[PDB]
Write a protein that binds this DNA or RNA. Structure first.
Ligand code: MG
Lengths: 121, 114, 98, 55, 104, 67
RNA sequence: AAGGGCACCACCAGGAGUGGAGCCUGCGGCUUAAUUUGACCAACACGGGAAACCUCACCCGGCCCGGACACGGACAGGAUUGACAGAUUGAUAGCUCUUUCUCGAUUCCGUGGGUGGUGGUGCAUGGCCGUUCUUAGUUGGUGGAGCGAUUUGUCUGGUUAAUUCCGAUAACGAACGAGACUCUGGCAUGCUAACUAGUUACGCGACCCCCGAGCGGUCGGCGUCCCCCAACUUCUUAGAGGGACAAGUGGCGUUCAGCCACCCGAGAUUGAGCAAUAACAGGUCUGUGAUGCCCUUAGAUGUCCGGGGCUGCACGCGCGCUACACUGACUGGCUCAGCGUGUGCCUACCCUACGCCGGCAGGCGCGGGUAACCCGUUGAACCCCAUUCGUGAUGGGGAUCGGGGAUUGCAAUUAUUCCCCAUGAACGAGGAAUUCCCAGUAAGUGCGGGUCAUAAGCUUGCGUUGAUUAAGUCCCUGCCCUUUGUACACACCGCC
């Protein structure tokens, strides 16, 4: 439930009437022109999802681009977001719509502070 | 007007043009005893005056080299054709020209003199 | 340079029409400005002139961001027998009104 | 690569859109009065352009 | 045309502008056109301040540069024609001249 | 260094001999066994490709697709 | 060690402060695949260094030669190049493969040889730059002394900011530095000029008084260079000029250099720039088609593209900003600037009036300005006048954090920035220590430019308000000269 509407209505919710439901930044993002990279990724997920086996999750697809906003039509996909080193698979939950792909592939590993060295004498 | 830039940018472009021309003539007329360049500008046409010790050397065969450099500056800054003239002026008292004496010394040292 | 003939001869005849030619150093320039309709990327003309310099027919002066190629006397006959043009047509700097 | 990726990356603005009009460097340029010159090159040529020191 | 023209003179220095503004108007008086008085616009002062070091290491010395641009406006107005009458420019290098008309 | 992948193999051309993909018989009767690219930029001179499911024009890059 | 002089990068007396809290930024360290790298008074809001791409030099993958030229193989019965589709790929990179079309001498391979490099070397270097050192010092010729290293000149004394000058004088004659110089600011009712600045006068007007003034008052309302159809430069502009010289007086002084007080004067010390010899293994090969040498050069340290990173955090440090409140905060009203910018060769990207929409952040049309014509008479802030508050972590404080809305772009997430509504955290004036500074100065206070497609807590300048303290010293840190002592000379961070 993204804005009170259910997921299935979000599947057939076209871009122009969905931009109202999106926040300001996403609405500006859809208002500006989608490029061929986004469309190619969408086609790849559509092909994989349709060729996905029943009751079974699809195969993984990788991508460098992480500025892709999540569409409800991608819920439940296997996408590989690059972290600068590797492509990290991530589930698309039905609550991740207003989120970037890169928000879930962390670019650094967390810091566990060891003993400081010669510095800060 | 809209096509012509303001006074400030005009003076800036003039200075840039002068500096680029001087630097190019330095890098090109190094051995010909280059001393300095003087540009006289009119809206009808501009005049470029080059100060050098060896005027007979900077002028090519029947003025070939001076024609060459005139065509170079013509095609470079995109003047209208025949709106720029290249005059070579033989300097007086070449011992006083710091640039010319510096170039003669550099030529001497590259020659291998003590 | 995989550059074709259609621009090789065009650049060569431009170089022979007048004793010099002016080129700015930008390999990503889509087009060298003069002969604008010939559709010649700047990289092709730069490397053609560089090859000619390597074979010594032209010498090169480098200012801030430009090339000022000066055709040589050894370039005269080479342009002549590459353009199939008799030794009576000269570049502009050679003869004038005589 | 081919024509579709060798120079496809946009540089219609920004620091990578500009270079020193003399030394082709991208640092310390002076875009005031459309100068488009590196700082060090401006020091080199300021006499030639005519910017002199008074104070 | 009956012509009323505007002439502006500008350069970097003051002496050359002064001698041009003097010799032109003297020639006009000798050539009996009444002359609008010489008008000096406020001086343009292009100020550019830059660190002296080309390295950034040191005591932070900033060098400042000035280009004083001076410009003068003198109008030639005569009952007779002007441009066919006065044609000579007498212009040294370094000073810019631009001649406009009243309609311009 | 020590790249994890092996050094990338550049494509090697098939090194074709004489083309000879058009035949005449009975003292000579022309038979274009290749599709002709219809465009002016391709011209009536060149032939098109004879791929198993489409036809490619070398210059016009038109693809005539048949099901 | 003595003698003498001198400096808010020293002090004295003061002021504002930092260090105490939060935040911004750069170092260090930690962590990482990468957190690129230089720099340790004279590094640490520095590299004009406010990184989404680029930048970028770092990490992770994928392209091409943009390897000239020579020779030899290869070849029009084809050197070789591109490309539809399918996989494959992040990629609609014909990058690779299946598949066949197409270019034709441009190109392929090998051997030499290029070339490129933000690759290494600032301890090979040039250039510039900082520092010694903005103190006053420094050198030649000839002559004197000395075997000579050197010395004299270049100094007893006085005086200066000043080896500045007077003087003595084995020195004489010079030279640079300083001074001088240029700009800057201060007075010029003196000159010149002014429709891209105006002033004054007049006439149109509008409104208040009209009891009655009426040559009453305001107008940033309109006209009088619209060409005969007012004058003038006080204001504004910027040129020529002038003006200050210790000039006069009194006093001190060898009565020389000169110093103090006083008159008249705008000013009786306006600030900057430039700036000597010799140097530092101080910095920059990441400015350069500045460069020696060395490294790499096709699986590229070249170069392109995609993504990440340069922000990453147990902590330390520096330059800053916000603040700790009533000398205040909020709400309203009144009211005054100057610097300087504004539409682009590449280069797309200007400053903006007015009108409408929306509450704000913005958007929608009409213009102006390539500029003393337009923004703009730059209606700035602080300040001033009234309101509420009332000594509380309170209406101070706005860090953290949520939701939403706008602009730039191809892309705003690890939030670009702006805006609305929420949160009011430390902080009650800051240890040991320490920065800066003598008049339009510190401080408050805003505003321009630089970086900018988006932009300033930075910086360069600008203006507004505007002080206390002091006219001295070597006590601390040092600087310069003479004498002195040395076992130092890489020079007391010495030597032993
Ligand atoms: Mg409150």
């Amino acid at each position: 439930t993204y804005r009170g509407v259910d997921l299935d209505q979000l599947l057939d919710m076209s871009y122009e009437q969905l931009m109202q439901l999106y926040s300001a930044r996403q609405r500006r993002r859809l208002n500006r022109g989608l490029r061929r990279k986004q469309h190619s990724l969408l086609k790849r997920l559509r092909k994989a999802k349709k060729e996905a086996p029943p009751m079974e999750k699809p195969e993984v697809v990788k991508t460098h681009l992480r500025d892709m906003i999540i569409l409800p039509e991608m819920v439940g996909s296997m996408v590989g977001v690059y972290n600068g080193k590797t492509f990290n698979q991530v589930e698309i939950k039905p609550e991740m719509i207003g989120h970037y792909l890169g928000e879930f592939s962390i670019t650094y590993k967390p810091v566990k502070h060891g003993r400081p060295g010669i510095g800060a004498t | 007007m809209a096509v012509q830039i303001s006074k400030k940018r005009k003076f800036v472009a003039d200075g840039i043009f002068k500096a680029e021309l001087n630097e190019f003539l330095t890098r090109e007329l190094a051995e010909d005893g280059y001393s300095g360049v003087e540009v006289r500008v009119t809206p009808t046409r501009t005049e470029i005056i080059i100060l050098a010790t060896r005027t007979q050397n900077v002028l090519g065969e029947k003025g070939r080299r001076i024609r060459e450099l005139t065509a170079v500056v013509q095609k470079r800054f995109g003047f209208p054709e025949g709106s720029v003239e290249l005059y070579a002026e033989k300097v007086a008292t070449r011992g006083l020209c710091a640039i010319a004496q510096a170039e003669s010394l550099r030529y001497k040292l590259l020659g291998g003199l003590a | 340079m995989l550059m074709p003939k259609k621009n090789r001869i065009a650049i060569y005849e431009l170089l022979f029409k007048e004793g010099v030619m002016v080129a700015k150093k930008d390999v990503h320039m889509p087009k060298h400005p003069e002969l604008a309709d010939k559709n010649v990327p700047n990289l092709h003309v730069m490397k053609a002139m560089q090859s000619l310099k390597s074979r010594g027919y032209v010498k090169e002066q480098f200012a801030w961001r430009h090339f000022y190629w000066y055709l040589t006397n050894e370039g005269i006959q080479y342009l002549r027998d590459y353009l199939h043009l008799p030794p009576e047509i000269v570049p502009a700097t050679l003869r004038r009104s005589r | 690569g081919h024509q579709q990726l060798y120079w496809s990356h946009p540089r219609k603005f920004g620091q990578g859109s500009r270079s020193c009009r003399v030394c082709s460097n991208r640092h310390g340029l002076i875009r005031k009065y459309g100068l488009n010159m590196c700082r060090q090159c401006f020091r080199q040529y300021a006499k030639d352009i005519g910017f002199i020191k008074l104070d | 045309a009956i012509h009323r023209i505007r002439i502006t003179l500008t350069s970097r220095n003051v002496k050359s502008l002064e001698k041009v503004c003097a010799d032109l108007i003297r020639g006009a008086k000798e050539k009996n056109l009444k002359v609008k008085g010489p008008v000096r616009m406020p001086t343009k002062t292009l100020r550019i301040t830059t660190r002296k070091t080309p390295c950034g290491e040191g005591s932070k010395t900033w060098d400042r540069f000035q280009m004083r641009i001076h410009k003068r406006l003198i109008d030639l107005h005569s009952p007779s024609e002007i441009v066919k009458q006065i044609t000579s420019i007498s212009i040294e290098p370094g000073v810019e001249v631009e001649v406009t008309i009243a309609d311009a | 260094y020590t790249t994890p992948k092996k050094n990338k193999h550049k494509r090697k051309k098939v090194k074709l001999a004489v083309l000879k993909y058009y035949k005449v018989d009975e003292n000579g009767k022309i038979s274009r066994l290749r599709r002709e690219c219809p465009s002016d930029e391709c011209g009536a001179g060149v032939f098109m490709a004879s791929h198993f499911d489409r036809h490619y024009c070398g210059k016009c890059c038109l693809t005539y697709c048949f099901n």
